Amino acid sequence: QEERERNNQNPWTFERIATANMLGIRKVLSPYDLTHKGRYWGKFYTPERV
């Protein structure tokens, strides 16, 4: 889960967009989504989301 996060070939990741408030996305995201990094939605945990 760290090698798949270090070698990601996608320039944009949930951590980068949410923290920097790009596209004004904070109006849609929850304040807890800053810590969850998009891997947690409610009680559901998807391990494949980087």
Binding site: T19, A20, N21, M22, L23, G24, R26, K27
Partner: protein
């Protein structure tokens, strides 16, 4: 509750490859901004509406020049997702009082002092 977003200072640290990608100058920062609004103030909070109003960006797709001081940059960071920012380039330098009426601003971001001579 939905509130203002605090931008960490780590975002505004440019990588060494950023300067070559965007054509910036590694040593000397540029002097003036050219700000053009892209999106709408509607469906956005009220504090973003006021910042757009107080920057002279009421009408979209109209370039507006602002300084590069931190005071202006503090307001731009709030609405950085609603505007387009390009540096102001001066191939012929600052216009004089003789050539005020012949100035034209090209799309690429440069101000041509003498436009369509004769």
């Amino acid at each position: 509750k939905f509130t203002r977003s605090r931008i960490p200072d780590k975002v505004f640290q440019p990588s060494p490859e950023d300067h070559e990608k965007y054509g910036g100058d590694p040593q000397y920062p540029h002097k003036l901004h050219i700000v053009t609004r892209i999106k709408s103030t509607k469906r956005r909070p009220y504090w973003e509406k006021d910042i757009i109003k107080m920057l002279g960006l009421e009408k979209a797709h109209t370039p507006q020049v602002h300084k590069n001081i931190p005071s202006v940059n503090a307001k731009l960071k709030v609405v950085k997702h609603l505007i387009r920012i390009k540096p102001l380039k001066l191939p012929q330098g600052l216009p004089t009082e003789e050539d005020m009426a012949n100035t034209c601003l090209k799309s690429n971001g440069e101000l041509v002092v003498r436009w369509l001579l004769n």
